[PDB]
Design a protein around this nucleic acid. Structure first.
Ligand SMILES: [Mg+2]
Ligand SMILES: [Mg+2]
Ligand SMILES: [Mg+2]
Ligand SMILES: [Mg+2]
Ligand SMILES: [Mg+2]
Ligand SMILES: [Mg+2]
Ligand SMILES: [Mg+2]
Ligand SMILES: [Mg+2]
Ligand SMILES: [Mg+2]
Ligand SMILES: [Mg+2]
Ligand SMILES: [Mg+2]
Ligand SMILES: [Mg+2]
Ligand SMILES: [Mg+2]
Ligand SMILES: [Mg+2]
Ligand SMILES: [Mg+2]
Ligand SMILES: [Mg+2]
Ligand SMILES: [Mg+2]
Ligand SMILES: [Mg+2]
Ligand SMILES: [Mg+2]
Ligand SMILES: [Mg+2]
Ligand SMILES: [Mg+2]
Ligand SMILES: [Mg+2]
Ligand SMILES: [Mg+2]
Ligand SMILES: [Mg+2]
Lengths: 208, 151, 99, 83, 100, 127, 116
RNA sequence: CCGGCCGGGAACUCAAAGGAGACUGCCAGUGAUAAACUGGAGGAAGGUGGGGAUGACGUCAAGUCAUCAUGGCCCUUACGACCAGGGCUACACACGUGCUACAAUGGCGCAUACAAAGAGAAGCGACCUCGCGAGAGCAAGCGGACCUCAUAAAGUGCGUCGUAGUCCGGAUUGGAGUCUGCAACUCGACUCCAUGAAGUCGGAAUCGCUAGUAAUCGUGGAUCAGAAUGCCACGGUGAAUAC
């Protein structure tokens, strides 16, 4: 249990929080329950859409969600249709006048949430695992990445002894606190067990 | 320590006499952190300690400290068969710090009603060359001359 | 006098709101008393990081809360009501008062 | 002990059971799971078999059992010794 | 935990919210010193007929995402494991690692 | 017309005012003998005073808060030396060799996780 | 210096030497002498002969040496023969006030019995 | 009204935002013109200033299927579900971690100085009024540098007890209580009074600690209706020693 989660040690430094809201100690947990469910249904609904960073920002008795995604073209659907069809079940859970805005994420190969979801859906459909690793390791370096490291963990190929394997290209610092470390994790549910994916992506060092 | 050396930190002189060594007998006498109830047994030591002697208050303690200063001690080299107890010339600071440790030690072990009365029956006799702190200087100086063969 | 408190978790977004709330009534009013800081609560925590049995392996967390003060001594007719229509950023609850 | 401005504690059902016992006048063993009820002086001279987690063991209330509770006469563990 | 331990908890919050003003009245009849024992014998036998899940000291705090009855924190509603996981992503504003 | 000093210690901080006069001493509205019950604590506020020749030139007026017996007494000492230099600028060299113009920054070490104190680990036993 | 059917010590003070009675402590003996009117730091010797007389009229109202050893032996033997939980613990040498008997029951059981 | 409370004042403390500073940089000297190291003028700080967080590749088929998730297998009028009482608190006994002790550097009584960090709405709960006391009554004050929790204790001044199983130690049981709580028998904490064990510094063996450390003495907090000698956090006092 050796490595810290690289996002949490970077939250005051070069990384933002996904939820920027105030409360007192009275209604903090009721907002935290409110924030979890509205991210939970937006995951199940937009699991065919490329949503990466749901941001719950709720100022003064209304909730606002910026959906970070590789495409609005399925997230909007028709122009002003699925932005509104999902809103009426977002104002069900929270209990405030909702506003699901959208900010688009260009360059989908440089996202540790999407690389987690572009390897897992190939592991889900029985590809050779060692090929699927090498697409992500090679595609980021064409798109201008200073370093990548992918890792599949647990019962690879179907055999009975589990193991863990990984690859690396470029440079990924972790002890440097000012490193632009994109990092997330997925879950592969196959017929022999669970496989887990971890991806590190370094962009540069955001100066202070 | 294996690598390096530190020297000493500063030890604050007293309000009473203007001595470095008056702060150094209260520090060996202090137990459990109490400099308040230790510096006052020392102040109630030197009153009856110059009274029987008839000297100055500080100078009577410095003569009782003399008859218990160690001059040869045996340390352990332990490179032969058994432990060799090798006698060494002692540096001038360990002559003093071992002496004050032995005067505090005996005054714990008496049966009088005070601490200052257990103490002043020991710094009186330490200038009079009997007691228990001079038994410790001579039991160290008994082991240091039965090991004079080794160099 | 008119009190305005600000409680905020971020330490620069509350500094970003005080050159927002002064600049609404500095034009309309005068003798604004000023951006007075107050001390900071540091609400700390401790949990366990193992799922079953490791009592010495822990993470210490905290949540810090930031306080300022904006004091308007006497309003004009056009001081508070221009300040009234405004709404500040996220992560802040303002507390306007009189008394 | 329970406070005295509150007064004594008893179940509302066992109070109705003992009253119905004395008013009818039976010596039938009343079985009740109220180890937490304080014995009242109308319960003197009756057989009230209070449960101990496993079965029902009878108690014939004498005089000196007034300010006690019913569980003290129904032992709930069992022990003979180790060897 | 078990589904029958989350659902067992929910009615204890439901039943204790229904009979709140009725269990609180029978305490003040006994919290009154200057009342009659023809009333203070009526309050103490009436509170047994109210349900045991009506008491606010009967329901127990559980982690709101898993239902764990230990490691609880009241500011988050969660156990020690689920606060830690949600912190490292970022959904808990202000909650980072500390050192002094 | 006056002279000021600042001093600090473990959790202590003193406010030293200096006027010329008899050598009058007031410590938290109270006298030198009324405030410090401890003779060692009565000494250490006078430690720059015996170093230089200013036991009679200046009056000194003290309001110290926070800390303890030797905490406030070491706070007052560093502030008087700050005011001995605030007057003269010449005595700074003897006070430096006294070690009086240096704030001894030994602060209390916090309790840490897995430890009973700042450094006392619990009693280990191999079996 | 003879109070309440026992002998009370001579060279101990007023409130201390009365605590030799089975039935008084430091508090209840202050109730004796503040009612009677004697200072508390004099000994029981060199109390006058008009002082030992009235001092037992303060003592006689309390339930003391023989009157107090019997009602404790009546209390514990009353717990024995009802069959209560307390008296079962009084006839089996295992403590009464709820304490752990898996370990640290070394007063009511006596010191350690080796296995034979 | 002799109390920063109250004119007023922005000094000082304190608060918290932004800049400042420390880099072997300037000084001699050793060494290979190197890297470095030794001593120093300065300076609040000197050479990693002090503390933390940060745990590479892998090892132990290390721990957890009972936080959660999950391949497989197994259960289905029961291996699922609801209820009351009982049990998780048992005791010939064995080991690990603690608190309190064996006293005068102390116990009691009386007067009296000195902190830091915290929490608070179904919350904390001034004063007044009773109660031997924990508490109760009436009921202000505060969503809080405002108000309360809150009295720091060790210490110092004075006084006593003068080496006894004691004016040391507090276990243990008898009779009364209070409180939170539908409910204190099993199986809660606390108060008052009566009782007043072992214990007089511990064989072999073994542990922690290099400076604001150890030792010491208080204080808060989280879980929580209640229930800390535990866990985490805070200041006061403050050593010995390293050839
Ligand atoms: Mg770690
Ligand atoms: Mg590093
Ligand atoms: Mg489940
Ligand atoms: Mg509960
Ligand atoms: Mg400490
Ligand atoms: Mg431990
Ligand atoms: Mg061992
Ligand atoms: Mg007695
Ligand atoms: Mg120098
Ligand atoms: Mg230097
Ligand atoms: Mg195994
Ligand atoms: Mg196992
Ligand atoms: Mg299992
Ligand atoms: Mg049950
Ligand atoms: Mg258990
Ligand atoms: Mg053993
Ligand atoms: Mg005692
Ligand atoms: Mg005394
Ligand atoms: Mg009163
Ligand atoms: Mg004995
Ligand atoms: Mg007592
Ligand atoms: Mg003795
Ligand atoms: Mg608490
Ligand atoms: Mg509690």
């Amino acid at each position: 249990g050796q490595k810290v989660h690289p996002n949490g040690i970077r939250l005051g430094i070069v990384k933002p929080w996904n939820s920027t809201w105030f409360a007192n100690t009275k209604e903090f947990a009721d907002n935290l329950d409110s924030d979890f469910k509205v991210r939970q249904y937006l995951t199940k609904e937009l699991a065919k859409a490329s949503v990466s960073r749901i941001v719950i920002e709720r100022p003064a008795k209304s909730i606002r969600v910026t959906i970070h995604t590789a495409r609005p073209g399925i997230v909007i659907g028709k122009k002003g249709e699925d932005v509104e069809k999902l809103r009426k079940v977002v104002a069900d859970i929270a209990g405030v006048p909702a506003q699901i805005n959208i900010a688009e994420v260009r360059k989908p190969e440089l996202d540790a949430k999407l690389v987690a979801d572009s390897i897992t859906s190939q592991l889900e459909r029985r590809v050779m695992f060692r090929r699927a690793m090498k697409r992500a390791v090679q595609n980021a370096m064409r798109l201008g990445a200073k370093g990548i490291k992918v890792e599949v963990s647990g019962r690879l190929g179907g055999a009975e002894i589990a193991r863990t394997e990984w690859y690396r290209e470029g440079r990924v610092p972790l002890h440097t606190l000012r490193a632009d470390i994109d990092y997330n994790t997925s879950e592969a549910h196959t017929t022999y067990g669970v496989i887990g994916v971890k991806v590190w992506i370094f962009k540069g060092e955001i100066l202070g | 320590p294996r690598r390096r050396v530190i020297g000493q930190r500063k030890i604050l002189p007293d309000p009473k006499f203007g001595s470095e060594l008056l702060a150094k007998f209260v520090n060996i006498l202090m137990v459990d952190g109490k400099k308040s109830t230790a510096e006052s047994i020392v102040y109630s030591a030197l009153e009856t300690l110059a009274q029987r002697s008839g000297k100055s208050e500080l100078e009577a303690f410095e003569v009782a400290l003399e008859n218990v200063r160690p001059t040869v001690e045996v340390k352990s080299r332990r490179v032969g068969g058994s432990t060799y107890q090798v006698p060494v010339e002692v540096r001038p600071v360990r002559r003093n710090a071992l002496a004050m440790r032995w005067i505090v030690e005996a005054a714990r072990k008496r049966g009088d009603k005070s601490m200052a009365l257990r103490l002043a029956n020991e710094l009186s006799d330490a200038a009079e060359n009997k007691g228990t702190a001079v038994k410790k200087r001579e039991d160290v100086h008994r082991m240091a001359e039965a090991n004079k063969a080794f160099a | 006098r008119i009190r305005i408190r600000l409680k905020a978790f971020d330490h620069r977004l509350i500094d970003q709101a005080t050159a927002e709330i002064v600049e609404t009534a500095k034009r309309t009013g005068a003798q604004v008393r000023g951006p007075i800081p107050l001390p900071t609560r540091k609400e700390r925590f401790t949990v366990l990081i193992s799922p079953h049995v490791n009592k010495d392996a822990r993470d210490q967390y905290e949540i810090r809360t930031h306080l300022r003060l904006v004091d308007i001594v006497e309003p004009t007719e056009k001081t508070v009501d221009a300040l009234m229509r405004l709404d500040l950023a996220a992560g802040v609850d303002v507390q306007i008062s009189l008394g | 002990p329970r406070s005295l401005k509150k007064g004594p504690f008893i179940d509302l059902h066992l109070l109705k059971k003992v009253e119905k016992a004395v008013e009818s006048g039976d010596k039938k063993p009343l079985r009740t799971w109220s180890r937490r009820s304080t014995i009242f002086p109308n319960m003197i001279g009756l057989t009230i078999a209070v449960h101990n987690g496993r079965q029902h063991v009878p108690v014939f209330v004498t005089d000196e059992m007034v300010g006690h509770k019913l569980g003290e006469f129904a032992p709930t563990r069992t022990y003979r010794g180790h060897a | 935990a078990k589904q029958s331990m989350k659902a067992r908890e929910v009615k204890r919050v439901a039943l204790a919210d229904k009979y709140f003003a009725k269990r609180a009245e029978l305490k003040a009849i006994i919290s009154d010193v200057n009342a009659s024992d023809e009333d203070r014998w009526n309050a103490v036998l009436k509170l047994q007929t109210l349900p045991r899940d009506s008491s606010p000291s009967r329901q127990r705090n559980r982690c709101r995402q898993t239902g764990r009855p230990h490691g609880f924190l009241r500011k988050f509603g969660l156990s020690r494991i689920k606060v830690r996981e949600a912190a490292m992503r970022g959904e808990i504003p202000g909650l980072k690692k500390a050192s002094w | 017309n006056q002279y000021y000093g600042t001093g600090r210690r473990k959790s202590s901080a003193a406010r030293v005012f200096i006027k010329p006069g008899n050598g009058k001493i007031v410590i938290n509205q109270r006298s030198l003998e009324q405030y410090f019950g401890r003779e060692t604590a009565r000494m250490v506020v006078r430690q720059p005073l015996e170093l230089v020749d200013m036991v009679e030139k200046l009056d000194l007026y003290i309001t110290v808060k926070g800390g303890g017996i030797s905490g406030q007494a070491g706070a007052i000492r560093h502030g008087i030396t700050r005011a001995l230099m605030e007057y003269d600028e010449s005595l700074r060299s003897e006070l430096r060799k006294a070690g009086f113009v240096t704030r001894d920054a030994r602060q209390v070490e916090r309790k840490k996780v897995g430890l009973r104190k700042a450094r006392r680990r619990p009693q280990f036993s191999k079996r | 210096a003879r109070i309440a059917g026992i002998n009370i010590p001579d060279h101990k003070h007023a409130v201390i030497a009365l605590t030799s009675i089975y039935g008084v402590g430091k508090t209840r003996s202050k109730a004796i002498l503040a009612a009677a009117g004697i200072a508390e730091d004099v000994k029981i010797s060199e109390l006058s002969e008009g002082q030992i007389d009235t001092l037992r009229d303060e003592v006689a109202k309390f339930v003391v040496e023989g009157d107090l050893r019997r009602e404790i032996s009546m209390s514990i033997k009353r717990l024995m023969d009802l069959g209560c939980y307390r008296g079962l613990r009084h006839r089996r040498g295992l403590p009464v006030r709820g304490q752990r008997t898996k370990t640290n029951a070394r007063t009511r059981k006596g010191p350690r019995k080796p296995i034979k």
